[model samples]
Every structure is written in C-alpha cells, then in structure tokens.
Target: SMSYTWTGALITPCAAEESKLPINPLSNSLLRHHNMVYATTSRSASLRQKKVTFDRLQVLDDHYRDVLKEMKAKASTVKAKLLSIEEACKLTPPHSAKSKFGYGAKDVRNLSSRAVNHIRSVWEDLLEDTETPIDTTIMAKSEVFCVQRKPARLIVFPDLGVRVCEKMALYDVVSTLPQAVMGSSYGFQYSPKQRVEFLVNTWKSKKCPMGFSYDTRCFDSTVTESDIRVEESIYQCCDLAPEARQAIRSLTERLYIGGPLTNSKGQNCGYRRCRASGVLTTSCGNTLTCYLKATAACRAAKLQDCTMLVNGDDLVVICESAGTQEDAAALRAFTEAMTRYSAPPGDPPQPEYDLELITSCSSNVSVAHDASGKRVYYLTRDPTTPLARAAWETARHTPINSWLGNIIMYAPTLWARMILMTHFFSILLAQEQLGKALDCQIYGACYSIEPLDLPQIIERLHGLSAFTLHSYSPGEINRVASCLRKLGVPPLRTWRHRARSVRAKLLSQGGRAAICGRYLFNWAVRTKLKLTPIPAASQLDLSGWFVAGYSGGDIYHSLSRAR
Candidate 1:
C-alpha cells in the first residue's frame, strides 16, 4: 500500500508564517545568531512528504500474537465511559480548526446550539453511515528549531464537529486505555521527577544493566492499515457501550485506516494510507503499536529482564547485560526484529553501560546537587532546540510557548535554570506579561500557565530542589556549554548576571512575581532566600500533567483541575 498519493496540489498556509527568527532586542539578548533559528512552514511539506513516504513490510509471529493477547487482556479490564457532547466540546483547544459547517472552535467550546446540534448530527451520522471516509485537513506544522533545517511535519485532522464526536466516543478510552494496557512501560504516565526515579530504579534493579534508546524511522508512516486495524481490535477489547463500539469501528474504517488529505485552501493534496498524525487515537495507537512490536522484538532477541519505557514512538529499554560483545549483538538482533516488524530505527541501537548515555524522549538523566548537598538526579536535554524556540518566543507572540514547557520539564537542569528561566522571565518582566497566562505543552497536552505562578508550578512538578540545584555533572555542563557555543547563545556567566537583574525586577514587583524571583532565581545571588515548600504548591491541581501524551489530539487545560 502507498503511504501517500499526491494530486500535485500545494500545501498552502492559512495565515502569515515566518521562516526565520525576527531580529529584535529581546531575541538578540538571548541569542546572537538569529539566522540559526528557523521555523518550518508549508513550503517544506513536500520535502517531508517525500521523506515519510515508503513501502512497509511487516512479518508478525507468535511472539507478536502473544503480546497482543496480554495487551487485550489488560484492555478488556478497562471500562471506558463515553464523554457527553458538552464534556467533549470543553476539551477542544480554542485555536482548533473550524468546522466546514459554519461553527468555529470558540462556538464549540461554548457549546453553542449550532455546534452541539451539528455535533449530534455528526455522531448520528457516524452511527448511520459506517462507510463514508471522514474529511480531514492537512497542514504543515510550523515548529521552530536551530540549524537542523528539517522539513515541516504534516498534521492531518478532521473538522471540529467530527473531532468533538471523536472525544464523545473515545476520550475515556485514550485517557485510560494506554496506561492500563502498557502499565509502567507507558512513559507518559510519569512526571519528569517520577520518570527520573523510574529510570534510576530500573537501572539499579538490573545487575550489570545495559540500556539503549530506539528511534523508529518515521514511526507514523510505518503504521500500515493492518497496524491500525490491530490497534482497533485492542480498543474493541475494552468494555464499551453500543454507540461507542460502533463509533470506534466506524472511525477505524472511515478515518483511521486511510483518508484523503485536503490543503487549507480546500484542494486535494494527497491520500494518506498510513496513520493520521492528528487523530484522537494517535498517541494511544502509536504507544500500543510501538510497545507490541518492541516487546515481541525483545523476546525474539532473547534479551534478559527487558524493561521498556514507551511514550508513543519514543522508547528506552534497560535490561541485564550478558556481556559487552553479546549485548551489542543482541541489540543488532533487536534492530533486525523491529525492522522486520516494520518499525526500523532512524539510528542503529547501541548498548550503553552508563544510564545517562541512553537518551529517550529527547532527555537524559543527569546528576546535580541540591541545597542540602544531596545528589539529585533530574531530566535534561540538549538546550539547542529549547534555546532556539525561546529565542523565537522572545520575538513573537505564539499560542504555545515551548520555553515555558522546557522550564517546567527541565527545571532542575543547569541549562534550564541559568538559561531558559533567566531568558524568558526577563522578557516577560520587560513586557509586563508576568501576570498573563501563556500556554505550554506538558506531555504533549496544552496548558494555560501564568509566569507569576512559576514558583508553585515548579515546586509542585520538580520540587524545591529545582531552585537550589547546583554542581551539575561535568558531562551535563559540557553539553550545555557546547550547545550554547553552537547556537551563539550567551554563556551561563552572562545569564547569571542577567538573572540577578531580572530577579531584582521580579522582587520589586512583589506578590507572585517576587515569589518567582525568590525561588526560581535563588541560584544567581550570593545571599539566597531560605527555600521551603511553597504554600500554594499543595493546592495546585496538577493531576493530569503527566497523565498521557496528547500531541495532535487537540487537548487543552481549561477543563483540567488546575486553579
């Protein structure tokens, strides 16, 4: 089957899009080389399409069926409730694409009669006609990065009404099913702190552990019709209502299996026979499929005590080592198995004796010292992407700020504290946007966060150690330093000086901003405030921060239990 068949149509943008970071005083303050920062746009969609399109060959064996049986047994225990139309509508992101039926995302959010009635009609239509392929809009995602110049990622999704109907049918399933089916192997179930703990515990549990992270080459394109249908079979195993079962079956055939892609201008761009990147079941399906293949691959490779951490397509495995040479050969066998299963690696897997050497979810666990001189393990990544996106966010007003997301997820890291927090807070203080709510994605779901609430958010997510962390590991320090040099970002010393000034400004403002300065920038000053548990941190309802990955699932935080 073809991954895509284009009709010679262009992927047009609906609004003005910038390809390079704009030269501004704020952006230049954070990064000197503006040209390094670039955003992918629709113009590069064709290139990405070429790269993702390929023929997939899969050979499923007894091991695959065995794992499938285990997953189905776990899934069968899950009883997923169908979300009401109102509940589903509230889950919609405000900036979601409008329905072709006249109502928009805002109207859907407000549960307007037109939106609700049309949503009901869409649901009724789903029950009535189980054969029509649902219409989906395809667009190139505008994501910022540094120097790599990767092509734009394509997003394919249905209209607002159909999306709402999707939620009404499968919200509970996606929210609950993956975690139940995969157990601790489901990576999105853990927060950053919890993830670090899991990694550390898993590594320590194995005698002579050898770990490696697997990168699937375009995992989305690797998903074939058989894969989607297999995922549907797993979903159907869950206890569900009659309409929910019908809707899932209908969506599986009509939308999930394959769909036509239309550009923003309503012209047919192509037909996608692989996975739809923007559908409701994307995260769940990808996680299930990736886990199924990887688990079977592990057995096929005869690896020992294999424990996997899977977040959609991102995977890391830690298991007892046989020997250095044997581990290497075993990894090759694992790769061969995955290749035969249709999920080949972007880079060949290599066994690592040191846990920090194996990167997963673009993050590696590194060591830092807390104020109490206790060794603290925290998650950190190469700051190039975070710094590049921060530079762009400094200049432009974007809906979701990756800088904020990085700061929250990587709070205890040397780079995040000295660079990201210092850079973004300085800009927010200058623009007086400290009290304003900005959106950021955590575990792929969007949340409306306020800069003034950093103290509580960080305290709740990363703990008080985030503020006083110092004495970073030499390897971690060098990675951050090298990334700063590569991106022409100012060094840590410069950020420390700038943070003092920003800290003073935040302190002068009083209230939550002062708390931000006192807690987040305590590392910058010679004399530091006594860091203690934030009073407000306990009250914060961060229940869903690490619940699941919702990338391209059109999730928002308005309905979340956040104050």
Candidate 2:
C-alpha cells in the first residue's frame, strides 16, 4: 500500500460548496472546499503486496542473558491472575472499534448471549490449538503529527474473540512485569511530571548537562523474527495459566510475529515480517529490546557521565561532555556502537539542540511569554490534528481523541494551554461535560481523564512556575511562529485574547469552569491552584505502558532497550 505522510500540512479538502444544494450558512462556512478522501477499492489492482522487515539476526551476549534471567525471575513471582470473561469484558472501552463477530463493542461488554459465546469460543480455541496462528484483520489507522505529517500507519489487530483472549492471557503479565524489573524505566507508571523531573535531576547529576536524542528509522520494521523469539523467551520465564501460556504463544506466532496486512479497502496488502503494530505487548517488547541494545552499546561506548532517558524508540543521552574534540570522538564511538547493534540514526538526529529545535512524539518544546514575562520552555506539537478533530467533532464521532493527551502531556506549552484547552473545554462546558471523566490514551494505553484535573495535572507536570513564564529564545519564538503558520492555528497573542474571553465566561460559571479560569488559563490574573493527585486519574492502570524511560540512566532497566 502507498503511504501519505501528513507532512504537517492541511491537505484535507473541505467539502465543495457546490455540493451543498441547500447551501446553509453553517455548511457554507465549513464545507467551502472539496477534499478527496479514499472512498473505495475500485479493484484489487491498486492494492499491492509488501512485507514487514523485523526479521534479523540478534546477537545476544551475557548482558542480554542476565537481563532475561532477572526478568523471568521477577515474572515468576508476579502471580498474575487470568481475568475471567466477565471481568475482562468490563475493562473494554464502550467506544472501542467494533468487530465482525455479529455483535458490537457495547453488546460484548453487556455480555449479550451471542457475544459471550463468541468470546468463549475464541478462548477455547486458544486452549485447543497451541500451534495454528489466529487470523487478524488489518486496517490503516490515520494519525496526526506536526513536524512530518505522515499518513496514518496500519493497525494490525485481532477480532473481538482474540482481543478478549488477549486480555485474559497477557494483559496481567504485561501490566505487572516491567515495573517489577525496570522501576522508573517502567514508563507507563509515572506521570509526565515525574518524567520531566527525572530528566532534570539526571541532567543536574551529569557533569555535562548537554543532551542529544537517539532514534532509528522504521523502528517496528527492524524488530526481527529473533526479537519476537526473545520476547517469547522472556514471557515463558513467568509461570502462567496453561491457557494463558498457550494463548500468548499462539498470539505471538499468529498476530505478533507475523500476520496478514489488509488495507482500508479490504484488499490483501501482504504479510508482516516484523512486529505487528497493534499488539498489546508491542510497547514492552520494544522497550525491553531497545533497552537491552542501548545498555550494551553504552557499555561499549564508554562515554562518561552517561545517563539515558528513553521512551521506547525515542531516546536521549545526557552525559558529561568531553573537551570539544573528545566529545565528538566519544559520540562517534557511541554512534558506531549503536549501528553495530542494528540501531541507526533517524535523519542523523539533532544538535545544541535547543530543546526548542527538537521534535519528539510529534511534539516540540518551546518557550513562550506569560503575563508576567518570564521565560518558559514548554512542550508543544503542530496543532493540525487537534484543530482538525475539534471541527470534525462538531460534525460527528471519531475514534481518535488526542487533544486531551496533547494538553495533558504538554500542558505548559502555549498552544495547548490556550488553543487546545480553550477549544475542547469551551465545547465541553457548553455540552455539560466539564466534570465528566472521558477515556483517552497515553503511551499506547487507555486512561480515564477528567477536565477538572487540569489544574492539578498542570501544577505537577509543568510546575507552579509555568503560569509566570514569559519570553522565549529568539529561535524558539521563530519556530513557534513558524509552527502556528504551518498548522494554521492562531498566534500566541490571538490565543491569549481568546483565553481572556473564555476565562471570563468560564469564571462567570462556577465549579470546574471557575477553577479552569483561575488555574488553567494562561492569561489569568493569578493562578491559585496547588498540585495534588487527581484521584480519578490515579485509579488508571497504565502499567508496563512505556510512557517514559531513558537509555543512559546510571541504572538501566535491568539491561534495557535498543533501536
């Protein structure tokens, strides 16, 4: 299948004005232009065959062995309980994509007789066949990014039967094991505040605070067949339900290791030779393998004051900088070591790297001025998708819900605090959802987040100082301006004005709205909110989610990650 990189542009065509025969004012405003959305498969000819490229030779040494042994030992003690059909069904989100099982997601959760039987049959099949690979249907998943707008990647997952089976078989293991082995490197467990504080602390500890992120091209493609086997080995170390064990193995062979690739049009694309994009274990597997590779490579590089902060394939190495020339040589050696391990740079990475100049997870960290004119470096991303979605939400339902995640993780950023929160909260407040807790995803797992938690989350994640932050580095400002132009989002000054108006309206109303005015508004007079844990957010189980971690930590994830 051909891929369309979003390339950070609003390539979407609005519906043509002529098509609206009734020509109402609302339709005129939103649908003035026509855009082409792939409608259907005209024929099989347009579909093409391709293979995933994860299969490769893995060179494991004593370090790898030691990590595996330790992980296996920890897993053995986990005592994970397999979830029952009913219990597991309860965890499924009401909005999760439906299946061809003749039942919808809600029906399954409600345990409609047919849904229950279908789910049971799926589990029984896992117990019945330890060898045959289960069939999984695939579809293209459209996602948004800022720097390089890329086409939606493919999401390969199983049917409702397999999905339910996965929850029973592997969910508990995936949720518990990484934290036991890796601690803070267990990314899923910590909030963004914890992650940032960890990095800042690590930087202070480093004799050289200089940092550069390491990355790889096509990370999923590089996970070899051996990598899957390695993942299997680690899982087998734990004592599991006989059914769980077989299901995991079966799922691994059929869905995780290799699977069919179909397109949105239902044409056979081909087979995946690498890691399947949508497996539950995908994050942990990548983190575990990536950590292992980087640790061993770090040992080889012998770079000083070296500590790492890794979030899956995205890695940052902060170490003592050698004298200028020495620093280059050390990095040279580190780069060599990474390549030797099959982890290579993606676009050669970056430099002094104004963190402002950096982009990760489709986000950029930039400085912006607040009412008090203090300098603040906050995380942000291109606003294309959030805007696209907000407008789309006004029209209909979409499975995609990322504005909340962006705002949470990048709360300090001007765009998020101003544009995102203003847009979403404005709508939510109008629709009576200000206090409603909604589900979203972070680090590839589900989370139930409440709008009221914004104050607490921002206070903790960005710090009490964020409200007073002002001017940015010239380069950072330039980049910020450029991002707004490219994304067609309003400028900071515009967002500021909107914030004040929105703030007044919100403050006029009490409760969450009043608090939103006092704390979440960037242009507000004073921020009175103090940081505290949001109980609702705390109840989420984002375990083994791999939202945070580093490669160069003084302590590694018990022999951690690679490319």
Candidate 3:
C-alpha cells in the first residue's frame, strides 16, 4: 500500500503563519542575525511530503518475533481502564483542533453538555462501527530553526470528538504499557539528572562500552500496515474493559491502521497507510515498534549485552564492545538489520567508545564541577537550535516556550545559563510578564511553567549546583562557542555583561524575582550570593515532571502525578 496517495489537494494552514523572525528590538539583543532564523510553514510542506512518502518493506526474523513475544508477555499484565468522557476531555490540550461537529477544545475541557454528548456519540460510533475510515485533518507544522531549513513537518489528527474517544480508549494503555514493557529502557521515565545518571551507570556497567544513537529516517512514514497491526496485537495483550477492548479494536481498524487525510480546506488530501503522527497511540506505538526493531537488530548484529533507551523514535544503545574493529563491523551489521526491518538510519550509526560522544534525543552527557568542586554529570546538547528557537520566541508569541524548556533541561550548561536565561529573563523583565505562566514541554509533555518559579524548579531538579556550577568541560564549552558562532549569537563576554545588568534588575524586583537573580544569574556577577537549598523547591509537585513522553498524544500537566 502507498504510504499516501494524494488527491492533488495541498496541505493548508488553519491561519496565517509566520516563517521569519520578526524585527523586534529585544530579539536583536540576543541574536542580530534575524535573517538566519526562520520557521517552516505550509510552503515547504510539499518538500517534506517528498521526503516522507515512501513504500516500506519489513522483513521480520526470529529475533523480531522473540522480542514481540516478550513484549506481549509483559503487556498482558497491564490492566487498562477506559476513561469516562469527562476524564478524557480533561486530558485534551486547550489548543486542540475543534470538532467538525461544532465544539472546540474549550468546550471539551469544560465538559460542556454538547461536547460530552458528541464524545459519547463518537465512542458509541467506535463501538458499533469497526470498519468506517475516520477522517483526519492534515496540516503543516510551523517550527523554528536556524539557517538549516527543514521542510515543514506534517501533523495528521482526527477531530476533537474522536481524539477524546481515543483518550477514553487508549490513554491508560499508552501511558502505562510502554513503561511496564520496556522497564528501565524507557527514556521518558527519567529526568535530566536521572537520565545522566542512568547513562553513566549503563556505560560504566559495560566492559569496554560502545554506544550509538540510532535515528530512524522518517520513522512515522516507515510504519507499514503490518507494523500498526502488530502494534495493535501488542495492545490487545493488555487486560482491558469490554468497552475499552471494543473501542481499541474498532480504533485499530478505523483510525490507527490507516485513514483518509483531509486538508484544512475540507478537501480530501490523501490516505495514510502509515502511522498517524497525532494519534493517542503514536508515542507508545513508535516506542514499541522502534524498540522491537532495535532489539531484533542488536541480536542480528551479534552485539553483546545491548541496553537500549527508547523514547518514541529516538533511540540510544549502550553495549559491550568487541574491540574497535569488531564494534565498527557490528554497527554496520546492525544498520543492515535495521534497514531490513524498514527502520533505516537517517545518519548511519557510528560506534563511540566514549559515552559522552554518543548523542541521543539531541543531548549528550557532559561534565562540570559544582560549587564544592565535586564532578557532576549533566545532559547538554548543541545550543544552535535552542538559541535559534529562543531568538524566534523572543519576538513572536508561541504557544509553548521552547526557551524555558531548554533552560530547565539544560540548566547547568554555559549557553543555557549565559544566553538562554539571561536573554529571556531580560525580555520578560522588559515586558513585565515575569509572573505570567508560559507553556513548555519536558520529555514530550506540556507544562505551564511560570518564569518566577524557575529558581525553585532548577533547585529541585538539578540542585543548587545548577546555579553555582563552574569548570565546564572544554568539549562542552567549545560546542557552545561553536554554536554561538554558527548562529551569529552574541559572544559569552557580551552575554555575561548583559546578564549582570539583568541580574541587577531582577534583584531590585525582590521576592521570586530576587530568587531568580540570586540563583539563575549568579554566574554573571563578580560577587556571587551563597547558593542554598530553596525552601519552595520541595513544595513544587514535580513528581510527574519526567514521568513520560507524550508528544502528539495531547497530554497536559493534569495527566501527570507525583512519582
């Protein structure tokens, strides 16, 4: 089956989209190269369509079945419940697409009689009709980037009614099953601190460890009909409610397996025979399939003691090395095995002896010295994209603030501290929006984080050292420096000078603003304040902060709990 067959209709936008960074005075303070920053819009959708549209041929071997059998065995233990209409409605993002039936996300969230009635009807329809192809709206995602232009990514989602029903059917299953099955290998279960610890421990646990991050080229598109059905089989192993079982089965036949794609203009755009990127099961399905393929590939390559950390399509494996020559050959064999399984690499895997050199989920382990000069392991990534995104968000109002997420995720890094924090706090101070809550994603889940609470959040997640870290690794510093040069961001010296001013302003504001100044911007000042345990850090219910990845699953902070 074709991944997609178009009807000569174009992928359209729901509203006017901005592709370039606006000429704002504040953005120039952080990045002067406004021309270099751009966002992908519907105009580049055709190019992305060309890249993602492809026929997939998967050849499953004994290893694949063995992994599936094991996954099913674990999945069978999960007892998943069907969420009620109100429960599912509460999980919907406030900005989710409105239903063709006239209700919107606000209506759904409020559990309006009409929205609840429509959702109930949709669930009933799913239970009664198992063969009707669900209608999905396809749109181009407008995402920011640096000079490197990526085609606009496509998002295919069903209407709000069906989406609510999807939560009712699969939310618990998706939320619980992957962690139950994957165990320690589940990537979303760890915070940045915990993630770094896991990586370090895993690397040290191996004798001559060799690790590599695998990138599945167009992972969603490469998912064939067989793959989705196989995923459905895994879900079926779960102990489920009668309605839930029926709903899951019907959804599999209708929505999950494949569906008709409608553009924003209400025209038939195409039919998708691959994975739908915006469905409830996207994260779980992709993680399961990716893990299955990688586990099988590891076996075929004869890799020893392979420990995989998978989050959706992002994967990294730490395994015992067979020596440099053998490790190189093993990766080649692994690449071939993955290719045969229809998950070919975007960048072919390269064996790395050093764990710090292996980047996964766009982050790598790095070292820095804390206030007491004790070595601390932290996660860091190339700041070019973060800076580019920060530059974009500075001028434009975005739904989710990527800058805040980057700051939280990479709190201890040079670029995040010197550039991200200093720049954003300065803008927020100027705008007097410091107390306003901004949404940001952590491990694929959206969080409404207030800028003022960052001091407490950082203190809790990364410890007080996050605000007092020094002696960064040369490699880490060089990467930041190189990224700054590439993105035309200001030098560290300039940012440091700017940060001192921002720090002083934040200090003058007092209260939580003073906490921010005393903590986040301490490095910028010559006379640094004593870093201590934040009293409020323990009060924040950060339990579900790093619980799971819910990208495209329409998850919100309400779904998470204290761990």
Candidate 4:
C-alpha cells in the first residue's frame, strides 16, 4: 500500500496563474507526481510554517457557548449506533487504502476474522493508551487548482482503525451541528444553487456591493495549541458520554497536537506539531476557529454591516463597501484586524468590485449556451480536476468520481448536463456499472449511489431552473469565458456534437437507455422531451446525498434497489 514513491523535485514549474487556468493531462498513477508538493524542512521554510501554527488567537464568546449548547442538545436526542464490522466494511470502498495491519479492505469486507480481530485490537489500544502521542504519516497530495495547477498539499493522517473510531466518536456531531448553529455560515449545508442564490441576494440587498474572499495561508496550521484546547472545551460542552468525552480529548492531544511525519518512503521527514488534514475534527475545527476570528476581526476593523459565509478555510465576505477611497481604507483595516488575529492574508484579501465574481469552494456562477443557443446560468469550477479524476477512475477505482459530484452540484450547468453526465454514464454503461452501484464519501461517510438517479436527482435538486435560465452577471460571463480557455477544454459546441451522438446511441438501444437519453440531453432534442417518471428512482432511498443532512450510512440512494 505504501509502495508508491515520488522522488526528485517537489513539482515541475508550470504556467503562471495570472491569465490562464491550469490544464492537466488525463494521466495515470505513475505520473501522479506531475502534481508534486514541496515539503518545508529547513529553517527558512520551518520559520514560515512555525509562524502560522503556534501563534494563538480567536476568542469564543457567549455566542459560541450558546451554539455548543444547541449542538449538544441535538446530539443528545439522536441515538447514534455503532456499525457492525460487516456493515462498516460494506461502506468501505474496495480501493480504500489497505490496512497495514495484516489485511486489505476486501479481507475485512469478506468477514475475515483476522482483519476484524486486528481492527478490534487497534480500537482497544486507542481506548487504553490515551496518553501516548499517535504517530501520523504525512505526505503532500497533488491536486489541481482553478487558474493554477498545483503540486501536492500536505496531508497528515493516522491508521485505518483510528479513522473508524473517529467516525464512531465524532462523525455525527460534525456533520449536523455546524449547520444547526451557523445557518448560512455553515458552508456544507448550501449547494452551488443556494450559494448562487446567496451571492445574488447579497448583491440585490445593496447598491455597489463589495465582496472579497479571505484566504489564510495554511489555515489548518494557524490553529494554535490553545486553539485545539479551546476546541476540546467546546466538545466538552456537548452532552457526550463520559467515554466519548475522554476519547475526544485524547484524540485531540495525540493526533491534533502534532506527531512524527512518516513520508512516502517510510522515512522521518520531520514532526508535525499542527493539524491533521485527514482527521474528522479538521473541518469543524477550522470552521469554528475561522468564524470566531473573522467575526471578531470584522468588529475590530469596524467594517459596517459585514456578513460572512465560511466553509472550513474558505471565507467569502459580502458587506457594504464604503465610497472608493473609504472602501480601500476599510480593506486595509480588515487585513490589519485579521493579521492581528493570527489569520494573515494569503494574498492580502482585496475588494473584488463585483459581488457575484468572488470564487468560493473553487466555483463561480457562470454561463453557457444550451442546445437552442439560449444562455444558461450555472455554477462551474475548472473541469481540469474532474477530468483528471476521471482519468484516474477509468484505470483504478477512486473513492469518489469527480464526475458524479459535479453532475449533482452543477446539474443545471450546461457543461455538466451536456458533457459530464454523458461522459461518466457512458463509461459506467461500458463497464456495466449503470445497473450496478458505487460509493462516494462526502463529509467523511459512505453512501451507496445509483447512476440511474441522475435525472430525478437533478430535477429534485435544481428543478427546471437548469434548462431555462438566461440572464447572467458580467463578472460571471468573464469567468465562464476564462474557464473554457484555461482548462483548454472543448466548448458547448463540442458538447452539442457529442450529445447528438450519445442521444442517438442510447435511443437505438431503447427502453431505459432511451429514457436516459431524452432526459439527460433534454436540451439537445429537436422536440421538447418531457420527463417521464421513473419507478426506479422512487424505489431507491437517496436520502443522504446532500443538503438533506450530513450524518452518514443510510443505504443512500439504495444502489442495490436500482440493480
């Protein structure tokens, strides 16, 4: 499992991000290091890294305490049961990293007693040895970014059993509590549709709106030791069982306080005295701390009527921008306030004159023409990453197909409906996985998903707004243009060509293929194609996909039922 090694330079230099978006080839695992990450190991490097981690800031107030109380109250009402070894194993994807502890994921799923016993023993060790620092392996994971292609990012995570225990202890709480407490501030709760609605609403609320995205460099590391302790304090406020409380604290210290980093080659690169990107608490901890500091900083800056939406490290602020010079001064003050609070600007957060233009979650609301040449407004990020993942998926199993997530999130998007839906489903059909099922992890829990539900799920999630929307913001238009060029990908015209081909092929087969053809490419059909109800979608339980709630494992979309 640990055999892969990326030797040499961290990442080969590529295009500067100023003009074009990054376009990555559809390469395989051996070339995965095409996106490499440089680890900071020297005094200069460590000094920069250290500045972010140890400086403590962000104070919690009565508001934070009240939210914690509300969260605990909600958690107390739900009875979260631990999954059976078999049930948990079923949710584990076949491609998930193998346990170093004598068995692969398939071994555990097939009810191998050796795998089960080893897992149990690991859990027992976790409970018994609460004080010893947990050793964590660290690596830079390669990921593509919008406007810029990047190398690996630093990720630190521990063993497989600990991941299992993390789900048991904290998964339910993290999934549900933030949305309940933060409302719109809870990032995961909102879809791209809802996010677009939010941006539009904020813009409509004011004349001459000023919005900016604040990016903290290495946000997770900015979390001080005191920050982790404060996070523990918040967890204690929850009405948890005594054992749960003890486990949360121990995990916080052992994993959160930092540990030795074992690299890809199993050598000691160094020690991480900061955050673990792979842990369950990482998202919640960042969101809570970010919210606390940003909220406080807003007051200190005296930015009038500031509103924020935070998703872990991503922050989008929509506020009343003062007159030109005043707005400029306000931005400076905002930076000053944030830096003082230990959340320094990554690029010195600046005022983006247009509210709708600010990017969040790597997506911006954009426009594309449909089959009839009608302009359509939708959310899109650069498709480089999705295509990159698709390349990976075609060869080896991936935890989540970027195509699946893109279709769901951007169903209204012409690119998604016309391109992604056609692309992945065709692959699934070829591989005979359409009637079959796949599991994808969102918010750290597994759910069974059916390919058959694309139409129904799209309809339910976005409704008719997808096919008919026409007007768009100027800023949105500019981004839409750039996204096509930067990814060096085909445009709507090419998609139109593909859609005709795919639609004809599907209809030739008849039955459900014909049904899928008409609905998935409703835009391309000469005559308006009315959507017929699918009994298949109704029978499947697609309860946990998104926006419904974040708690996992309810046989979501019932992949078996679709089959």
> How well is each residue in 304-397 modelled by candidate 4, as lDDT tens digits?
7787888887888888877778877888887776676567778777787764467877777666554456755566765556654554455444
lDDT of 4: 0.60
Q: What TM-score, to 2 decimals, does candidate 2 have? A: 0.78
* Model 1 lDDT-worst window of ten: 554-563
lDDT to native, each model: 0.90, 0.59, 0.89, 0.60
Candidate 1's error at 213, in angstroms?
Answer: 0.7
lDDT of 2 by residue, 187-298 (tens): 4565655655555566567655556667776677767767778778777777788778888887777777776655444455456667665666777677766766666666
Listed in order, each prediction's TM-score against the native is 0.98, 0.78, 0.97, 0.78
Ranking the candidates on TM-score from highest down gives: 1, 3, 4, 2
Model 4 per-residue lDDT at 85:
49
What's model 2's lDDT at 404?
75
Q: Mind giving the per-residue lDDT tens digits that candidate 1 earns over 443-519?
A: 77788888788889889888888888889999988888898888888878899999999999989988988899899
Flag regions of model 1 displaced more than 4 Å: 560-563
Residues 1-563 of candidate 3: C-alpha lDDT, one tens digit per residue: 67888888999998898998998988887888889999999999999999988877779899999999999999989999888887887787777778999889988888888998988989899999989999999999988888868899999989889988988999889888988899999998888898999999999999789999999899999898888999999899999999999999999989988999999999999999999999889988999999999999999999999999999999999999899999999999999999999998999788898888898988998999987899999999988888889988888878889999999989988888999998888888988999998889886677888899999998888888888889999988988888878777888999999899999999999999999999999898778798888899888888767766788878776442222
Sort the candidates on lDDT, descending order: 1, 3, 4, 2
